[PDB]
Amino acid sequence: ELSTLEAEMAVERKAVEDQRDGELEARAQKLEADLAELEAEGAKADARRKVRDGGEREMRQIRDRAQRELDRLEDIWSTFTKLAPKQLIVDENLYRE
Structure with missing residues (x-):
């Protein structure tokens, strides 16, 4: 299922960027x-x-916000693709995702 999951993930990232x-x-x-x-x-x-x-500060805030979302999704995708037994998930939000 990796190809379909990678595709849907890529689409989600695209939506955040758009x-x-x-x-x-x-x-x-x-x-x-x-x-x-x-x-x-x-x-x-x-x-x-x-x-x-x-205005520049607010744009910086928009770009930093969306960047935090992109980094979160990236961490999710790396964690799932590299997921292995004995690995600890400390973040509650990350495990729930």
């Missing part, structure tokens, strides 16, 4: 649109730089 890229794109267009809204109104360069810093 969702991540969609979130990051929506957040990028939103950041540019918000900075454009603040440039139309009177605004300080330092205030707009604060807004851009916030």
Whole structure:
């Protein structure tokens, strides 16, 4: 069954990556649109730089979140493919997955 399991796993990873890229794109267009809204109104360069810093931090959070999900799924796949008797699973979440 390894070929089918590897396929379905690959599809799941793809879904996580596609969702991540969609979130990051929506957040990028939103950041540019918000900075454009603040440039139309009177605004300080330092205030707009604060807004851009916030947007970049949020994108970093989206990419780090999706990256944590990808790493979790990767650990699951490595653990299952290498699974052998006498091996200890310390993480409750990993064993339940």
